[PDB]
Enzyme design. Structure first.
Site, PDB file in Angstrom:
ATOM      1  N   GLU A  55       0.830  -1.214   0.000  1.00  0.00           N
ATOM      2  CA  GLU A  55       0.000   0.000   0.000  1.00  0.00           C
ATOM      3  C   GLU A  55       0.866   1.266   0.000  1.00  0.00           C
ATOM      4  O   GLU A  55       1.936   1.307   0.621  1.00  0.00           O
ATOM      5  CB  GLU A  55      -0.970   0.018   1.225  1.00  0.00           C
ATOM      6  CG  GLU A  55      -0.211  -0.176   2.530  1.00  0.00           C
ATOM      7  CD  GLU A  55      -0.992   0.074   3.793  1.00  0.00           C
ATOM      8  OE1 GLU A  55      -1.651  -0.872   4.241  1.00  0.00           O
ATOM      9  OE2 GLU A  55      -0.907   1.200   4.322  1.00  0.00           O
ATOM     10  N   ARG A  66      -3.531  12.848   6.697  1.00  0.00           N
ATOM     11  CA  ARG A  66      -3.066  11.938   5.647  1.00  0.00           C
ATOM     12  C   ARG A  66      -4.138  11.700   4.570  1.00  0.00           C
ATOM     13  O   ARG A  66      -3.807  11.651   3.381  1.00  0.00           O
ATOM     14  CB  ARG A  66      -2.623  10.612   6.281  1.00  0.00           C
ATOM     15  CG  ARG A  66      -1.884   9.633   5.398  1.00  0.00           C
ATOM     16  CD  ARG A  66      -1.260   8.476   6.174  1.00  0.00           C
ATOM     17  NE  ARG A  66      -0.889   7.356   5.309  1.00  0.00           N
ATOM     18  CZ  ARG A  66      -1.092   6.069   5.592  1.00  0.00           C
ATOM     19  NH1 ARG A  66      -1.642   5.696   6.740  1.00  0.00           N
ATOM     20  NH2 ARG A  66      -0.716   5.129   4.729  1.00  0.00           N
ATOM     21  N   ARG A  70      -5.533   5.911  -1.611  1.00  0.00           N
ATOM     22  CA  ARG A  70      -4.505   4.878  -1.589  1.00  0.00           C
ATOM     23  C   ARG A  70      -4.324   4.229  -2.956  1.00  0.00           C
ATOM     24  O   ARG A  70      -5.262   4.127  -3.739  1.00  0.00           O
ATOM     25  CB  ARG A  70      -4.866   3.730  -0.635  1.00  0.00           C
ATOM     26  CG  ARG A  70      -5.109   4.125   0.810  1.00  0.00           C
ATOM     27  CD  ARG A  70      -3.833   4.534   1.547  1.00  0.00           C
ATOM     28  NE  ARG A  70      -4.001   4.847   2.965  1.00  0.00           N
ATOM     29  CZ  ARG A  70      -4.400   6.020   3.453  1.00  0.00           C
ATOM     30  NH1 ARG A  70      -4.665   7.048   2.668  1.00  0.00           N
ATOM     31  NH2 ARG A  70      -4.510   6.170   4.770  1.00  0.00           N
ATOM     32  N   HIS A  85     -10.114   4.515   1.387  1.00  0.00           N
ATOM     33  CA  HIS A  85      -9.422   3.754   2.418  1.00  0.00           C
ATOM     34  C   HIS A  85      -9.877   2.295   2.377  1.00  0.00           C
ATOM     35  O   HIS A  85     -10.219   1.723   3.384  1.00  0.00           O
ATOM     36  CB  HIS A  85      -9.635   4.337   3.834  1.00  0.00           C
ATOM     37  CG  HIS A  85      -8.651   3.843   4.843  1.00  0.00           C
ATOM     38  ND1 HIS A  85      -9.040   3.242   6.024  1.00  0.00           N
ATOM     39  CD2 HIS A  85      -7.299   3.826   4.845  1.00  0.00           C
ATOM     40  CE1 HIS A  85      -7.966   2.919   6.722  1.00  0.00           C
ATOM     41  NE2 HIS A  85      -6.896   3.281   6.039  1.00  0.00           N
TER      42      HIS A  85
END
Length: 96
Positions: A55, A66, A70, A85
């Protein structure tokens, strides 16, 4: 198994494209958790051996934190996008 939806690489957010370029160069990566193994415990991605998936964070520019974006890579160079996520995945189509 059922297929995943596809997303053309050029249709990704610009930060996601930036992350793909970093992966192709092997870094450097902005976050310490970038490159860790993604275990895929719930098998939303095809089930594979331990360590097949890794990841990476994709920067969310307008937040302090953050964020939820991803990229997951596979062991044969497959790339997956998740804006949320890991709740949904799209396979990245490098050809378009």
């Amino acid at each position: 198994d059922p297929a995943l939806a596809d997303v053309c690489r050029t249709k990704l957010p610009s930060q996601a494209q930036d992350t793909l370029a970093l992966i192709a160069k092997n870094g450097p990566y902005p976050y310490n958790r970038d490159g860790v193994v993604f275990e895929n415990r719930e098998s939303r991605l095809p089930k594979k051996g331990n360590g097949y998936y890794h990841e990476f964070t994709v920067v969310t520019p307008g937040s302090n934190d953050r964020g939820t974006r991803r990229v997951v890579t596979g062991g044969y160079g497959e790339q997956y996008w998740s804006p949320d996520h890991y709740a949904t995945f799209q396979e990245i189509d490098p050809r378009c």
